[PDB]
Amino acid sequence: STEELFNEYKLTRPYMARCIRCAVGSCHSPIAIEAVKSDGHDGYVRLQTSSQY
Amino acid sequence: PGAFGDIQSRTVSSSDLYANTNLVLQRPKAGAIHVPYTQAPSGFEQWKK
Numbered sequence A: 001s002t003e004e005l006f007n008e009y010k011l012t013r014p015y016m017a018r019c020i021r022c023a024v025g026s027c028h029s030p031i032a033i034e035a036v037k038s039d040g041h042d043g044y045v046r047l048q049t050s051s052q053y
Numbered sequence B: 001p002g003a004f005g006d007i008q009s010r011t012v013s014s015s016d017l018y019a020n021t022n023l024v025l026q027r028p029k030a031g032a033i034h035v036p037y038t039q040a041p042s043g044f045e046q047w048k049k
Helices: B043-048
Strands: A017-019 A027-029 A033-036 A046-051
Touching: none
Parallel strands: none
Antiparallel strands: A017 A027, A033 A046
């Protein structure tokens, strides 16, 4: 499992980005969503965000 | 734009890409850091529809 994350995390530093809705108006959110892909079949979506997992 | 073949690649692993999607850039909102743009919706997904 640790072989998959030499670079995708260890040098990456999640950022804070503009969000249009943060429960009050516009926003600079830590979980800003960059893309939502839903081209699969059974409701599975891949979501790119400013957070890291 | 907005039709099948709006973007084309010679091979699935090829390094070339012809793109024609009517991409245009809009002015950023006041006091905001982002790149607004307007495009014709994907021709592949419309073709699948």
